[PDB]
Design a protein around this ligand. Structure first.
Ligand SMILES: [Zn+2]
Length: 167
């Protein structure tokens, strides 16, 4: 069980497009367990493999307060089920410390493979709909600061670059 390093904006490796997982084997499940331990230790409720510099399409999440409901989505995809949008103040383990409003479709249908490689779908609303979209964006090399004004993003980017220099 390893705690992996989480890349942070503006590390260009966060812009890489993740490649699909072609077989869910024990190597993939071990990575998932390390991604869950990394996410729980952060702590965060969602983590995409791109963020730990593994460019494969795997997202782990656990939206509960007690770390009792882990969820795995491999080769996830979602499709909005409404044009209605909800605004949620998002944060991100790779943009630590910043939380900003992002509007996204309120309800979406996810399709993915589960921890055994079997395909399933799931309708998501609430925080699950926000999280799966945010995490699928990671696999496509997108971050939530990309939705913000360019001057806020630059201000966040400069703040983090400054912190990375001091660290
Ligand atoms: Zn994130």
């Amino acid at each position: 069980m390893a705690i992996l390093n989480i890349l942070e904006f503006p590390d260009p490796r966060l812009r890489t497009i993740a490649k699909p997982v072609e077989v869910v084997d024990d190597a993939v499940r071990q990575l998932i367990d390390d991604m869950f331990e990394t996410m729980y230790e952060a702590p965060g409720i969602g983590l995409a493999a791109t963020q730990v510099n593994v460019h494969k399409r795997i997202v782990v999440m656990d939206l509960s307060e007690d770390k009792s409901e882990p969820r795995v989505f491999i080769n996830p995809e979602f499709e909005p089920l409404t044009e209605e949008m909800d605004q949620y103040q998002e944060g991100c383990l790779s943009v630590p410390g910043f939380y900003e409003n992002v509007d996204r479709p309120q309800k979406v249908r996810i399709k993915a493979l589960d921890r055994d490689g079997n395909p399933f779908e799931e309708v998501a609303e609430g925080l699950l709909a926000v999280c799966i979209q945010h995490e699928c964006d990671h696999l496509n090399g997108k971050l939530f600061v990309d939705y913000l004004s360019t001057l806020k993003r630059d201000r966040i980017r400069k703040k983090l670059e400054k912190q990375h220099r001091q660290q």
